[PDB]
A paper describes a structure:
HIV capsid has a pivotal role in regulating viral DNA synthesis and shielding viral DNA from cytosolic sensors. Previously reported X-ray structures of HIV-1(M) CA hexamers showed two distinct conformations with respect to a channel at the 6-fold symmetry axis. The beta hairpin structure (BHP) above the channel can assume ‘open’ (His12 forms a salt bridge with Asp51) or ‘closed positions’ (with a bridging water molecule between His12 and Asp51). Inside the channel, 6 positively charged arginines (R18) are hypothesized to mediate electrostatic nucleotide recruitment to fuel encapsidated DNA synthesis.
Author numbering:
A (entry chain A), C (entry chain A), F (entry chain A): 1 to 86, 92 to 220
B (entry chain B), D (entry chain B), E (entry chain B): 1 to 85, 95 to 219
Write the structure that this text describes.
């Protein structure tokens, strides 16, 4: 990664074993549940493209997903080159493949990230990777929201947990609550809780619905 | 987070893997037991709004609770905007890190004078966590009754653990909760506690039923 | 905590996850055995009142003990206010509730701890907490020294271990050896070892008693 | 390794116990799966030849592979000496850290201009690791065939894992491997994949057989 | 402990959680095996008396041993006071950290010239630990005899482990312990060891009975 | 150990608990397999003689090996004194027992290691220790290369692994491949693989032999 030392200047540091092992274990434990994306963003903080490739390449399984991620990176790369056609001791401009760390050296990557003004090739590449991870998370979501239905003896809290977890994966995003998803939550509740939720009438908050079906 | 380096100057650092893993494991182990709030406050020390969103977003389960937390944040956001018509002034959505950049967040937190958007957002999150802790509290204090063979210490432990979760708070001891602790004790210990008379300390009650 | 940076000046640092997890695990493993107090003193080194409250508040069980600790803190607080009745840019004097971190901000706590001269509100509060932990350790000591008696086939070393562990908890303190506890150690030994210990005569050291009952 | 301290100057540090243990555990867990190469490149960042030899020498098993690695290093060493007749110039055996001191290695790596003997040696080691990864690849891509009840995603996972090991490389997707992926699919999924027509993306194939 | 920061100046730091946990775990795992003394010396490096008391006080079991240790410390304290009638001079109880403040301890350890009260107290503690190690040594060297089917290496391991604990020390090899090692060997290996003749090295004895 | 601080000057640091625990665990796991030597060299980097004695003394078992190591150290010590017979504020010259940290203080050891010019007593002692560890590794090698023979159903890769692991321990060294060890590898292969290896003819590489017996 690129960080400020105690002298306050930008400098390259080797990716830490702790950071790398945390990412490898995140992928092993969480697969492509939607929470893997925020973990990726946190652990890749300050990353060079070289660091980002290290993080993706150290993954041993999920090679179908890693090939889907490469298609997305190549698409984002081509789009960058399309919208960016092309002084002594200054950097050549970065191509798509330079941002993805394929055709760029570490020295060039750090050069761009510490140039005046900076070209944050690390942050641009991280954005492309997250677009690919979002796509994988939606593809791998195992159950449609249409089939998330409260079991006849499933507590309402456990049903609401499954419901909002499914919406988060299908949208690769937690901005999923609104008047219409409230209606779907009620539609897919079991007969007992459904009858109770309808009697609350319109505009019932999640707190009030969860309280009303708790007994 | 924003911290003082060894040169003593305020600067942004990446959230540490250790800190992130500690929070994720706290939530996995402790669910929404009341002690998760002090753990949240400790592990979010010096946090930017961006760091606070990282900590909440890395939680994979409890998505019902995460939506309750968002409603509370949005309420606190609207209230901030209502009471507040080099840096542009922050809106509610800037404090919650939705419409603000890292650069803006660090700008505000290191401005003269500082606008601690990190500490303001942490306050809103704790309000939401308190609400979740009370919602998830499984047992009313009314149902905490000493078993016929339960040591008094084990009953007092269950009693004050229940008050803490029901009130998302440990300022639960007073003359009336003392009365309820006595009321719900088993006949043997209840008879002993009454004979102490009024105003008995917790030490004296726990000594007398030991 | 408050520490000296490499420039040698006093500054606040966030409590470390390692420190917090060590305290939480100390309490989970050691309950209120007397060794929890020295662990508390070591892990709370440089602590602000805010840090000390973090350490106590992160404990999930033992809420009977945590309420006993609060009674003791409130007593120490009232006593401070009793014995301390009440320039531009200097600190207001601390009340009991400011030392316990209830009515004081972090900024005020660090202010006091780095004032000329310093008011060590962290060290004053730690003292109050240790008085509360001492009281809990004595209350929770499960066996009176009167009932620590060598089993008929218990090795003498194991009996002496139980004896001095009990004295440490009942006094919340390891200054427990003297001519009279030597006499009690002999009184409560099994008939075989008791007969051997009496024949040593007066003034026998612990080494000599432990050697004499080893066979 | 040779790194910049907080004063921003290049200096030698002892290899860290954490780094060494991470590499030893990577080799124990992952054997010569292709992902061991990127782990090697990450954990050897800033390495001197001395550090690289430490990392290879601390491996206790796989001594057949360690001798294959040495043959490759000796080949790269001879090739360097062939193409290269304050610091004396480095020989192949100086880059591999056999005939060079730490002082010489750090000298070269911090010279104006620098001779990155660490990065040159790491390149030779990766060439050797690639060779081992292909030798140890247990299954030909020709034998990766979708089971009659195997989900397509699990078959695609096995297919691209096999190409990666057979080629010690993840640049394995192209029009002809797409054709082989279809050829080796089960009858049901094969019939679906053919009806998509030519040029179907991996996303579209994986969606269609889901 | 008192250490040099990166500015190269002597300053007090809080004992680290890692160091404390390492010592507590050393005592839990190794009891009073002789190797606990070198572990104590390593983990107490730069310790103030306050730090040394923290390390001893955090031990929860072995309270018989902890009282033996205190008798030895009090003996060394009295002896110091006997031979020693800006900083006031330290008494025995000041070196053991009973009657001295942290400020005084750091004062002495950073005085010109320094009075290393930390190193003096560590010496007294090691004297006490040596005494405990010998008391707890479970087997006399006289009872270490090679089994009829015990490999010689396993017998030599038990022999030198026993001498180390009996003497709280690894300077145990000499012409007379060589003679005892031979005397207590099994008949087969004893006959072989005698035929080597006098002055045989440990290498040659271990080779001959292999 | 002795290291450069961020001011770039040589200074003593306490041995780290992590470093010590890594060495103790290396010895517990790897015994005296030949890879323990490179682990010893890595973990003892920058060590004073005092640090090196800490590392050896913290080992609880293997006391036969620790006495063999002491014989070798004493031999290297005597040899140093033989080949080194003997200004204000400069260091006395080191004896063998000063390099081994027996008759030298930490202050003297750091003095020598930071003298102009330096006497690297740490690196000299580490060399003596490695000579002792090499000797132990050869002594403890459990099987002669003469008895490493491919099992009738042992895969060739597993046989070659055992073969080169044995040569490494018997030479305490991995410079073990050459035309004659190639001949011994063939001699000791099972009849099936032996017949295949002979038909390759002379000069066959290890890659070609391992490929030819893989089926």
């Amino acid at each position: 990664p690129v960080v400020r030392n105690a002298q306050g200047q930008l400098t390259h540091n080797c990716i830490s074993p702790r950071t790398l092992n945390a990412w490898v274990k995140a992928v092993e434990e969480k697969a492509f549940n939607p929470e893997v994306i925020p973990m990726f963003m946190a652990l890749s903080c300050g990353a060079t493209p070289q660091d980002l490739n290290t993080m993706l390449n150290t993954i041993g399984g999920h090679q179908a997903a890693m090939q889907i991620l490469k298609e997305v990176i190549n698409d984002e790369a081509a789009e960058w080159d399309r919208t960016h056609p092309t002084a002594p001791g200054q950097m050549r401009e970065p191509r798509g493949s330079d941002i993805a760390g394929t055709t760029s050296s570490l020295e060039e990557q750090v050069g761009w990230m510490t140039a005046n003004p900076p070209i944050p090739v690390g942050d641009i590449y991280r954005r492309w990777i997250v677009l690919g991870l979002n796509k994988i998370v939606k593809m791998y979501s195992p159950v449609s929201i249409l089939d998330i239905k409260q079991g006849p003896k499933e507590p309402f809290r456990d049903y609401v947990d499954r419901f909002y977890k499914t919406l988060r994966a299908e949208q690769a995003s937690q901005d999923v609550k609104n008047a219409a998803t409230d209606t779907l939550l009620i539609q897919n509740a079991n007969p007992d809780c459904k009858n109770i939720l309808r009697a609350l009438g319109p505009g019932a908050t999640l707190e009030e619905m969860m309280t009303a079906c708790q007994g």
